[PDB]
Amino acid sequence: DVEFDALLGSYCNTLSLVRFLELGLSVACVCTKFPELAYMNEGRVQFEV
Amino acid sequence: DVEFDALLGSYCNTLSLVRFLELGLSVACVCTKFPELAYMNEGRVQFEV
Secondary structure (H helix, E strand, C coil), rough: CCCCCCCCCCCCCCHHHHHHHHHHHHHHHCCCCCCCCCEEEEEEEEECC | CCCEEEEEEEECCCCCCCHHHHHHHHHHCCCCCCCCCCCCCCCCCCCCC
16 A cells, blocks of 8 residues: 655745835825934924915 | 924915906906096096987
């Protein structure tokens, strides 16, 4: 008697990487970066009308 | 310890300027200018039909 078992095939994914600046939605953002933020208390913006 | 606050940006408007003679309504007038209006008692126009 000759018997055995087998693997047949094996399958991974490939994850999908998303850059945010690719999205259409990135229009709404104005993205600037502080390297140092956590030192900062309240921030401000001034508007004249 | 180090902390701070910050101004981020300052935003004005720009006042729109409107010439009246730009308007489609300017058709209705006939705009002439008296340097001295205040010396005029009743003024007149004459129509013959």
